[PDB]
């Protein structure tokens, strides 16, 4: 024969001793408080207040500013007859080219 071994323990059903089980623990008071901790700090705190936080981020990565600033510049250069954008990012007077 083979060695001295414990047999396979049968798989427990948490609903047998506790039909009101939330599946967190076999102690029902610990089970209910684990459920309340998960649901309050997960849904009531992180999800709700976190989605509210993300919804009211103060102009995340200055997009709104960038529209408003663009609405300045267009309005400056529509009126002064300038082109809306130059092809040159940098002034060609402040660039030395390698001569050839």
């Amino acid at each position: 024969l083979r060695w001295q071994e414990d047999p396979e323990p049968e798989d427990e059903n948490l609903y047998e001793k506790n039909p009101d089980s939330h599946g967190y623990d076999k102690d029902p008071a610990v089970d209910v408080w684990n459920m309340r901790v998960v649901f309050f700090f997960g849904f009531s705190i992180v999800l709700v207040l976190g989605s509210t936080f993300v919804a009211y981020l103060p102009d995340y990565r200055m997009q709104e500013w960038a529209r408003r600033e663009a609405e300045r510049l267009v309005k400056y250069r529509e009126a002064h007859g300038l082109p809306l954008m130059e092809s040159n990012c940098f002034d060609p007077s402040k660039i030395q080219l390698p001569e050839d």
Binding site: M62, A70, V74, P83, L84, M85, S87, F90
Partner: protein, 171 residues
């Protein structure tokens, strides 16, 4: 509201109602019902909320960045100057992105507004769109995900060498 120069609209010409039939159209009755049942309660609620705003008025500001020296007048590997030049370049690139967005909004608003004669009546918005997309493309296209003011300056210097060579060979 907004500024009517950066977002322009032509003057609205609606025709006067000239009913030929004797049948009353339901649209006028539904417009009167929308004015009574919907528009006046919404207006009264908004006037209440607007009075509550006027009780405590406070202000926000559009942030003004002064111009720092750009990447051309930063010494090579001088991180304190070229950091500020790079931040200025990133802000200007984000603003140029929004300028292209403004001109695209003008183009799309003209296409809806002019309707079935949109092709003739939106040539100016199409021309402004073509100019600003050519400028944006010459300035920022093909830089890559790791773009910087250095990549943009190298692209501009390559384009200026090509333009100088084309001017020299044509004379």
């Amino acid at each position: 509201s907004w500024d009517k120069d950066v977002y322009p609209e032509p003057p609205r010409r609606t025709p006067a109602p000239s009913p030929q039939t004797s049948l009353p159209n339901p649209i006028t009755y539904l417009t009167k019902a929308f004015d009574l049942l919907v528009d006046r309660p919404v207006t009264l609620v908004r006037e209440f909320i607007e009075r509550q705003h006027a009780k405590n008025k406070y202000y926000y500001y559009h942030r003004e960045f002064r111009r720092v020296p750009d990447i051309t007048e930063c010494h090579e590997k001088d991180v304190l100057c070229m950091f500020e030049a790079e931040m200025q370049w990133k802000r200007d690139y984000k603003v140029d992105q929004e300028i292209v967005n403004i001109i695209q909004e003008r183009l799309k608003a003209c296409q809806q507004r002019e309707g079935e004669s949109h092709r003739q009546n939106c040539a100016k918005e199409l021309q402004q769109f073509t100019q600003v997309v050519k400028a944006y493309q010459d300035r920022y296209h093909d830089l890559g995900a790791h773009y910087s003011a250095r990549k943009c300056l190298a692209k501009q210097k390559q384009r200026m060498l090509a333009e100088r060579k084309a001017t020299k060979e044509a004379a």
